[PDB]
Ligand binder design. Structure first.
Ligand code: F6C
Ligand code: F6C
Ligand code: CLA
Ligand code: CLA
Ligand code: CLA
Ligand code: CLA
Ligand code: CLA
Ligand code: CLA
Ligand code: BCR
Ligand code: BCR
Ligand code: PQN
Ligand code: CA
Ligand code: CA
Lengths: 31, 80, 172, 739, 42, 75, 122
């Protein structure tokens, strides 16, 4: 039994935080 | 532009100036050699980097050295 | 004895003017927020007013079709729901363009009142000429109609597009 | 000028397309950036390392999430020997029905890819059992990547930017990385094995909800503090134990049984736990060697600069001058990177060599395609790491080495007899190549003329003796572990040879990869491997030692690591830079790893066929390799799609061609050189300028790729084609032919 | 049936929308953004 | 089920005494205002308030440790 | 107006190839839809290219043939605003021409009856 719709959506929402932090780190390194 | 340097081993044989296809070098008065002249590169902005001057130089090691640097329209030899 | 500590303040006055009724925040002055807002079609540097209205119209007309297709009163049938969504987008966009026209008619008489006067320095309202507003409106109308029709065509062809995006058109 | 690249005004003023290309090729060469200081360099590197760690964690999280979402982990648990693990689902909207049907397999109702990375076996061995656990792990790794990204951002803020002295403090870093990064991590992994992995392998569920009040051993922690450690080794798993069940399950948490678990044919979990416990203890002990803040501890600079051996005068350690080296390594990031890359390459080679012979994961030894893929993957990575180690050694020679601070030490001596070093490497390479190729072609001619008995077939007696000394009784030698009466086998003073029974059982097993039987073909291919290693080392060492200069170019150090040439004068100087030596050595590295992986794959294919005689009789001449390995095993790969239909190998079939395409493309970049393309581009520029209705116009003047750029692009195409072609062939020939 | 792409996993419409978005919808705008970034005058 | 609680034994006396003693060393060297009020070696010479606070916190922390271990079968 | 005429022509003829030899050619309606979609995608990509060309070319004094001193008679659009007006015309004309071709192909049976007098039976 694989994960459900809610788990996929929760993973997608959680992955936003590393994405934003990666953008912040990239812009800081570009400085 | 490229950088062209002339070291004190130059014997004033004028071969590098003759070999240059863009008139970068010229002979100037000097007292460090028997020929009483030394090569100079006042117009390195026109240097393409062909290194014909290094090929023509007879001293060992070379008395003239070309160091390729930032590329411009004329240093890339572009007619467009 | 008095230490305002403005030099170490994370929130600074907006554009160095403490008395312009604004703050320098992440929303108003961060590099990402400035890059996003200033490069929207309403603010992108060098854009002609017609091209501004075109891009805005295409985006807004496209998504305005959706709400009536899903939860509208014709949602029981596919063809009826899509027609109602297209009509709703057309009615809203035409009404908005009529409002834009009468805004230009009334605002630009003599020296315009408020933020569109000659001495105004409203950076958020750069369309200072009447001809710019009419060029904007033409782009808004044509863009909104095109975007609404594009959404309508995709929804009308949902069955074909579903087979398209699943490879079902490669059976024969 | 343009804003891009921000780090180079010379490139920013370039009016041609070159400006873009070089901007990508020099972005991460922080030392050459405009206005770069050492402290800023170290801080930027530290933040970039945080970013790379975050990327690694995101990659692991993605693998876990895709397995938990679209894989068949739970179904694979119930039958690991017959269920194909699923990597992820396939969504290619331009497939036909035959392709969809062909790729719908492994119990799935949608097209899927078959996982070959072995992550299923790894997760099964370490106690993972449900898709929910994989999902939780993926979420945790997402959070960890976010944490590391935030740390990278934070350590760039002015108050948290470390000083140069912090980066230069070698001794505390060594202490912390030996005791904490290596030792404490190993102890934590042993704790995970004892508390979670072993109970799960014994059919008992242990998780975050109950691990606090479920002791891993009945004796508890009292046995450890009292000194009754032997209680942890009592009652191991029986030879009839069934994995993931309590049938035949023991209770010991730290055994030293050795060999393999009889069912899974992989290393005992208790053995691995005790291994990691011992490694943790050893590394924690090692992490206390150097002096940081309390006086006690060795000072590396003092050891390197020492000149007295208990009173006697010596030039240094082994009577060799090592003085001044502490500042040399400490101030040269390229030197440290060279050791780091060399160590990682050796470790990757060791991983590849020890994982197929001693599988650590349950049933992974019976997944032939997974074994081949893992071995090839880690060996190629090791080759790349070695090439990088030597390339950065050359970069150190050019940029960071200064003769006066290294006068008289061993590095100076190496630089001074570089000629002897290079000449002797060349001699070894010539001898190996001449004799190996000559014997190969002699055997080829003899077999072609119906005289296979006239082949020169040298027995690998030394390696066979080593195998016998390790316990292999097949060859008839009676030395050391193959002699039950030997002093080594009995271990007479203590008889603590608790490894010998299981180790001998694994060694003398005829169905595993532990010390495979070897003959003349193995001898010849090992000497070919030695030739490849020596030639690649010759190229890399010649490039590194000649990086500063040679007779042809006495002032090479003034021109940098990577430059095209020094012109056609003095006979011509094409490919004279050390970068060019690394470029040339990549070809030889690819060739050597190709030989190594060909040997491994053909031997294991013969073993898995039940046709070992084919390899034994055909590997002694090169036509045997050409016919029985490549031509014979390419049939199923090239029949993945044909005028009669398609099957699951179609992708490999296509990719096999794709690699062949990329390889071909590289030749164009490697044979044709710049001026031809520059003149052609000039003609095209005229054509565009004189054509009406073509309102477009270049903002960057189109020019041909530079000489060094062309070499790099050709090498990239060559490597990509090499890897793609061999990977497609490997997967198709192993998977389409076996389970 | 095996005449179309389907998914038995949760939210099988997600590949249906994301493959076009990542591979032939967003990439051209991303290329345009990069082109604007690398061609900006100093 | 009801969490397990063990009968009194010298081990719980060791836990409470050790927790009180360790807190006494740390508090006299870490709190912001020790040596305030009336005064009572290896210690930092704490005041009466600091010592009583350390003993009270030793009972609070020690009780949590004793019940915590007894609940889980010594963690 | 230049952009409008060019767009009408190009969007008109860009529909055909996928209609005739595309992967949806087995059915008329699907083939016409695929041709219209292909024309729309190509035209939108071209318009995005024109927009970014205008964005990057006209900064300060443009490089190459669009500089103030350039005398390229084959490249007369020397102003950014002209390029944006051209792009708007190109997009609108391309969409209109693609839709016109799509409407003609969707009504192929009706138009065939029209051009043969079959609508005069009743
Ligand atoms: C920009 C603009 C422009 C223009 C306009 O404007 C142009 C034009 C011309 C004319 C004149 C001619 C004819 C055409 C044809 O046929 O071919 C092509 C095709 C195509 C398709 C091309 C393309 C076109 C355009 C580009 C289009 C675009 C659109 C898109 C869609 C956009 C997209 C965008 C997104 C974002 C992606 C040509 C040509 C040539 N090219 Mg040339 N272009 C250009 C661009 C470019 C670039 C980038 C490059 C690099 C890759 C090149 C390349 C080349 C070569 C190699 C050659 C040859 O050979 C040819 C000749 O000379 O002959 C004679 N070139 N062109
Ligand atoms: C690949 C390749 C290829 C392909 C494939 O294969 C194709 C196809 C195709 C198909 C779909 C069609 C048919 C269909 C039939 O048969 O039937 C219907 C008809 C009708 C309905 C018709 C009816 C009548 C009409 C309406 C008339 C016309 C009008 C005009 C246009 C106006 C004119 C104006 C001024 C005077 C000029 C067509 C057409 C075409 N086109 Mg093609 N294509 C190609 C190409 C090209 C190129 C290059 C070029 C040049 C540019 C081109 C042009 C053109 C033109 C103009 C045209 C028309 O009109 C048509 C139409 O759209 O239609 C509607 N392509 N297309
Ligand atoms: C116990 C304390 C501790 C721990 C666990 C670490 C851990 C780490 N440090 Mg570190 N460091 C420490 C103390 C510690 N440090 C101290 C005291 C200093 C100052 C002297 C530094 C200064 C420092 C620098 C300057 C850098 C690190 C970096 C790193 C990371 C290396 C990348 C990686 O994942 O390695 C892999 C981890 C493994 C366990 C693999 C080992 C397996 C091998 C191959 C087999 C043997 C790693 C997470 C690097 C970084 O930026 O990372 C963010 C880096 O550049 N450290
Ligand atoms: C022929 C050599 C070879 C082989 C057989 C493998 C085998 C493997 N690698 Mg691998 N790898 C290699 C060389 C190789 N590696 C090299 C040289 C690099 C450095 C670039 C990597 C970098 C690498 C990464 C970063 C990852 C793997 C992973 C894997 C595993 C899953 C992928 C797979 O099915 O195999 C590979 C099958 C192939 C046919 C290889 C060719 C694949 C493409 C077509 C090559 C061309 C790339 C691209 C198209 C060109 C640029 C764009 C598998 C064990 C994955 C893993 O760990 O699994 C979780 C993973 O994430 N490898
Ligand atoms: C931890 C490993 C590590 C680290 C930190 C570095 C760090 C560095 N290397 Mg190095 N290197 C390594 C491993 C490493 N290398 C290995 C394993 C090799 C052997 C292949 C090399 C070979 C090498 C050479 C030959 C040179 C460097 C150079 C450099 C420096 C500048 C990087 C550069 O050119 O800009 C960034 C460079 C790139 C981004 C290269 C573009 C990508 C290449 C072409 C690969 C092709 C992409 C491929 C299709 C897919 C890859 C995955 C994709 C996501 C990109 C920098 C200090 C250069 C230097 O110091 O100049 C003096 C230099 O000339 N290195
Ligand atoms: C099949 C391809 C092939 C072969 C056989 C060789 C062979 C060789 N390379 Mg090489 N190389 C190749 C491809 C190849 N390379 C490619 C594609 C590259 C990337 C550009 C390189 C890059 C490279 C570098 C960078 C280096 C070498 C080196 C060497 C030599 C070391 C091995 C050796 O001494 O063995 C023994 C010699 C041989 C096996 C050569 C064949 C000898 C023939 C069979 C003898 C026949 C005699 C017969 C009478 C001739 C018939 C008459 C005829 C003249 C008409 C050797 C000559 C190294 C070197 O020179 O070290 C000394 C070195 O530094 N190569
Ligand atoms: C690095 C990890 C990684 C990798 C390589 C993949 C790979 C893939 N994913 Mg995926 N995914 C991941 C993590 C990853 N996933 C995570 C963590 C999530 C949960 C948020 C998802 C959720 C997800 C969905 C919902 C879908 C895919 C799909 C796919 C496939 C098509 C690509 C796509 O549409 O992306 C979609 C990707 C996302 C929606 C989010 C990705 C988030 C990751 C963490 C970003 C990683 C960025 C990377 C590290 C930076 C690269 C740097 C560069 C220098 C290389 C492809 C096999 C599709 C599929 O199954 O097709 C059949 C699909 O529909 N993924
Ligand atoms: C260092 C030893 C130690 C240990 C092993 C424990 C262990 C425990 N404490 Mg505890 N505790 C400690 C020290 C310790 N504590 C200290 C020093 C204090 C301060 C006085 C407390 C104060 C405390 C309170 C106030 C409570 C616990 C509770 C608990 C139990 C929670 C069960 C659980 O998993 O909840 C998991 C909970 C979440 C994940 C949320 C657990 C047995 C709770 C309890 O009685 O549980 C039955 C409870 O209410 N503890
Ligand atoms: C901010 C952000 C975001 C958001 C976004 C959005 C909100 C979007 C939207 C979008 C949209 C909403 C879009 C749309 C688009 C559209 C289009 C693209 C259209 C087109 C059109 C066309 C093409 C048309 C055509 C035509 C015409 C013109 C005429 C004739 C007919 C036709 C139809 C042909 C998110 C949250 C995500 C994230 C964060 C950030
Ligand atoms: C040079 C020449 C030639 C050629 C020609 C050509 C190439 C042509 C083409 C042509 C074409 C290719 C054409 C086209 C046209 C088009 C059109 C005419 C269109 C129109 C459109 C419209 C009308 C639209 C409308 C619309 C809109 C706008 C919106 C809404 C919807 C609709 C649809 C209504 C030849 C060889 C013959 C001969 C020699 C010379
Ligand atoms: C073909 C060839 C060319 C011509 C090739 C050129 C000018 C490059 C053309 C590249 C086009 C315009 C785009 C190709 C893009 C790639 C498919 C992907 C690039 C990926 C990055 C942008 C990320 C040379 O200039 C050259 C110079 C010196 C030695 C050999 C050669 C050589 O072989
Ligand atoms: Ca079809
Ligand atoms: Ca009629």
């Amino acid at each position: 039994m694989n994960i459900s719709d809610t788990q996929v959506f929760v993973a997608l929402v959680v992955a936003l935080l590393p994405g934003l932090l990666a953008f912040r780190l990239a812009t800081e390194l570009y400085k | 532009s490229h950088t062209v340097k002339i070291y004190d081993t130059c014997i004033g044989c004028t071969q590098c100036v003759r070999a240059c296809p863009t008139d970068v070098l010229e002979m100037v008065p000097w007292d460090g050699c028997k020929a009483a002249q030394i090569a100079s590169s006042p117009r390195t902005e026109d240097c393409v980097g062909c290194k014909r001057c290094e090929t023509a130089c007879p001293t060992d090691f070379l008395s003239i050295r070309v160091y390729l640097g930032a590329e411009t329209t004329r240093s890339m030899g572009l007619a467009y | 004895k008095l230490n305002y500590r403005l030099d170490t303040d994370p929130v600074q006055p907006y554009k160095g003017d403490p008395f312009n009724s604004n703050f320098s925040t992440a929303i108003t002055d961060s590099p990402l927020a400035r890059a996003f807002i200033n490069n929207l079609p309403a603010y992108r540097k060098g854009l002609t007013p017609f091209m501004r209205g075109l891009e805005i119209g295409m985006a807004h007309g496209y998504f305005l079709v959706g709400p009536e297709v899903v939860v509208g009163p014709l949602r029981e049938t596919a063809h009826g729901a899509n027609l109602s969504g297209l009509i709703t987008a057309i009615y809203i966009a035409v009404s908005a363009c009529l409002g834009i026209s009468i805004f230009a008619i009334t605002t630009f008489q003599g020296d315009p009142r408020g933020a569109y006067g000659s001495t105004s320095k409203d950076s958020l309202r750069p369309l200072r000429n009447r001809d710019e507003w009419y060029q904007l409106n033409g782009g808004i109308f044509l863009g909104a109609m095109g975007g609404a029709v594009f959404a309508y065509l995709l929804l009308e062809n949902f069955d074909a597009l579903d087979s398209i995006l699943r490879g079902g058109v490669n059976v024969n | 000028a343009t804003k891009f690249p921000k780090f180079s005004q010379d490139l920013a003023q370039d009016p041609t397309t070159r400006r873009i290309w070089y901007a990508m090729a020099t972005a991460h060469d922080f030392e050459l950036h405009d206005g770069m200081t050492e402290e800023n360099l170290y801080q930027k590197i530290f933040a970039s390392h945080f970013g790379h760690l975050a990327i690694i964690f995101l990659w692991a999280s993605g693998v876990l999430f895709h397995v938990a979402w679209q894989g068949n982990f739970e179904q694979w648990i119930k039958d690991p020997l017959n269920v194909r693990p699923i990597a992820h689902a396939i969504w290619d909207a331009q497939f036909g029905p035959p392709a969809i049907e062909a790729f719908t397999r492994a119990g799935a109702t949608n097209p899927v890819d078959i996982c070959y990375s072995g992550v299923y076996h790894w997760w099964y061995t370490i106690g993972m059992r449900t898709n929910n656990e994989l999902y939780v792990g993926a979420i945790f790794l997402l959070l960890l990547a976010a944490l590391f990204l935030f740390a990278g951002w934070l350590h760039l803020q002015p108050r948290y930017r470390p000083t140069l002295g912090w980066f230069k403090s070698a001794e505390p870093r060594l202490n912390h990385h030996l005791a904490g990064l290596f030792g404490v991590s190993s102890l934590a992994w042993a704790a995970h094995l004892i508390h979670v992995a072993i109970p799960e392998s014994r059919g008992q569920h242990v998780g975050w909800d109950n691990f606090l009040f479920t002791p891993p051993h009945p004796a508890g922690l009292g046995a450890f503090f009292t000194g009754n450690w032997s209680a942890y080794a009592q009652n191991p798993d029986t030879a009839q134990h069934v994995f993931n069940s309590s049938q035949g399950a023991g209770t010991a948490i730290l055994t030293f049984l050795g060999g393999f678990h009889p069912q899974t044919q992989s290393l005992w979990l208790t053995d691995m736990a005790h291994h990691h416990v011992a490694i943790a203890v050893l590394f924690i002990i090692a992490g206390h060697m150097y002096r940081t803040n309390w006086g006690i501890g060795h000072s590396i600079k003092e050891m390197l600069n020492s000149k007295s051996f208990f009173g006697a005068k010596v030039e240094g350690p082994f009577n060799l001058p090592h003085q001044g080296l502490y500042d040399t390594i400490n101030n040269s990031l390229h030197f440290q990177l060279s050791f780091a890359l060399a160590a990682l390459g050796v470790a990757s080679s060791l991983t590849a060599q020890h994982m197929y012979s001693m599988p650590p994961y349950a049933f992974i030894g019976q997944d032939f395609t997974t074994q081949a893929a893992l071995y090839t993957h880690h060996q190629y990575i090791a080759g790349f790491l070695m090439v990088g180690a030597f390339s950065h050694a050359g970069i150190f020679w050019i940029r960071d080495y200064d003769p006066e601070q290294n006068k008289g030490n061993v590095l100076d001596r190496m630089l001074r007899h570089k000629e002897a070093i290079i000449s002797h490497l060349s001699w070894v390479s010539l001898f190996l190549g001449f004799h190996t190729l000559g014997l190969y072609v002699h055997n080829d001619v003899e077999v072609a003329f119906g005289a296979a008995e006239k082949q020169v077939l040298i027995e690998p007696v030394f390696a066979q003796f080593i195998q016998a000394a390790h316990g292999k009784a097949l060859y008839g030698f009676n030395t050391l572990l193959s002699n039950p009466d030997s002093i080594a086998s009995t271990a007479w003073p203590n008889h603590a040879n608790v490894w010998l029974p299981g180790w001998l059982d694994a060694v003398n097993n005829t169905t595993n990869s532990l010390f495979l039987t070897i003959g003349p073909g193995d001898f010849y291919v090992h000497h070919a491997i030695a030739l490849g290693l020596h030639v690649t080392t010759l190229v890399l060492v010649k490039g590194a030692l000649d990086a500063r200069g040679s007779k042809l170019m006495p002032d090479k150090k003034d021109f940098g690591y990577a430059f095209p040439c020094d012109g056609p004068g003095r006979g011509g100087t094409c490919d004279i830079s050390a970068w060019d030596a690394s470029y040339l050595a990549v070809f030889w590295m690819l060739n050597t790893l190709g030989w190594v992986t060909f040997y491994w794959h053909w031997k294991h294919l013969a073993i898995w066929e039940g046709n070992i005689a084919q390899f034994n009789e055909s590997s002694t001449y090169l036509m045997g390799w050409f016919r029985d390995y490549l031509w014979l095993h390419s049939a199923q790969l090239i029949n993945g799609y044909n005028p009669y239909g398609t099957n699951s190998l179609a992708i490999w079939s296509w990719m096999f061609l794709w690699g062949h395409l990329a390889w071909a493309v590289s030749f164009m970049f490697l044979i044709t050189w710049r001026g031809y393309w520059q003149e052609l581009i000039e003609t095209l520029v005229w054509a565009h300028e004189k054509t009406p209705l073509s309102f477009g116009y270049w903002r960057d003047k189109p020019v041909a790729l530079s000489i060094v750029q062309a070499r790099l692009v050709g090498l990239t195409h060559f490597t990509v084609g090499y890897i793609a072609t061999y990977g497609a062939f490997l997967i198709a020939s192993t998977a389409g032919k076996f389970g | 049936d095996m005449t179309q792409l389907t998914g038995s996993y949760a939210a099988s419409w997600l590949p249906w929308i994301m493959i076009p978005l990542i591979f032939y919808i967003l990439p051209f705008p991303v290329f345009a953004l990069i082109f604007i970034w690398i061609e900006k005058e100093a | 089920t009801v969490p397990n609680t063990i009968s009194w034994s010298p081990q719980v006396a060791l836990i409470i005494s050790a927790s009180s003693l360790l807190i006494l060393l740390i508090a006299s060297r870490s709190i912001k205002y020790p040596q305030v009020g009336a005064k009572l070696p290896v210690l930092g010479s704490p005041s009466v308030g600091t010592f009583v606070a350390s003993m009270a916190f030793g009972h609070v922390v020690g009780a949590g440790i004793v019940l915590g271990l007894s609940n889980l079968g010594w963690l």
